[PDB]
Design an enzyme around this catalytic site. Sequence first.
Site, PDB file in Angstrom:
ATOM      1  N   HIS A 179      33.772  42.417  48.115  1.00 54.07           N
ATOM      2  CA  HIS A 179      33.495  42.926  46.785  1.00 54.07           C
ATOM      3  C   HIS A 179      32.172  42.387  46.290  1.00 54.07           C
ATOM      4  O   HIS A 179      31.945  41.189  46.348  1.00 54.07           O
ATOM      5  CB  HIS A 179      34.626  42.510  45.864  1.00 54.07           C
ATOM      6  CG  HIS A 179      34.565  43.181  44.534  1.00 54.07           C
ATOM      7  ND1 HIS A 179      34.878  44.473  44.377  1.00 54.07           N
ATOM      8  CD2 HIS A 179      34.111  42.730  43.297  1.00 54.07           C
ATOM      9  CE1 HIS A 179      34.673  44.826  43.092  1.00 54.07           C
ATOM     10  NE2 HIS A 179      34.230  43.750  42.433  1.00 54.07           N
ATOM     11  N   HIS A 190      29.832  44.198  37.580  1.00 54.12           N
ATOM     12  CA  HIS A 190      30.359  44.805  38.780  1.00 54.12           C
ATOM     13  C   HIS A 190      31.079  46.117  38.462  1.00 54.12           C
ATOM     14  O   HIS A 190      31.277  46.434  37.295  1.00 54.12           O
ATOM     15  CB  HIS A 190      31.276  43.865  39.562  1.00 54.12           C
ATOM     16  CG  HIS A 190      32.595  43.599  38.930  1.00 54.12           C
ATOM     17  ND1 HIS A 190      33.740  43.523  39.645  1.00 54.12           N
ATOM     18  CD2 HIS A 190      32.958  43.373  37.592  1.00 54.12           C
ATOM     19  CE1 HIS A 190      34.759  43.301  38.827  1.00 54.12           C
ATOM     20  NE2 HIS A 190      34.288  43.192  37.569  1.00 54.12           N
ATOM     21  N   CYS A 247      29.817  49.530  45.651  1.00 54.12           N
ATOM     22  CA  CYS A 247      29.477  48.320  44.880  1.00 54.12           C
ATOM     23  C   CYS A 247      28.198  47.697  45.414  1.00 54.12           C
ATOM     24  O   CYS A 247      27.315  47.306  44.647  1.00 54.12           O
ATOM     25  CB  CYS A 247      30.633  47.303  44.806  1.00 54.12           C
ATOM     26  SG  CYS A 247      31.254  46.787  46.314  1.00 54.12           S
TER      27      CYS A 247
END
Length: 109
Positions: free
Chosen positions: A22, A34, A95
């Site tokens: 992540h 994020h 991401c």
Amino acid sequence: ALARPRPRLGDLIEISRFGYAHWAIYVGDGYVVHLAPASALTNKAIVKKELLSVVAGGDNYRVNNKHDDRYTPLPSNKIVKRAEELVGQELPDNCEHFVNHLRYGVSRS
């Protein structure tokens, strides 16, 4: 156990989940920006600002400014300002592209 540098403003943060990574970007005072769902199913994400410690939880994080040796990052204020201004916006690996856009201004290979 390895001593490491603490994050700096604009740093890319990579969190080692069980199975995958992540990404987030450090915006100061313990916070990251994020994406979160608004996987391959989710076609919309929301930009969130949260504590790094909350995002990471029981997982470790590392700073990984992965492209810096080949591509000069933007100045940290430009990185942070752009990350912060996106908080609350909905947007359509994802991401990682998001955080690369913010740090470098570009994300395509």
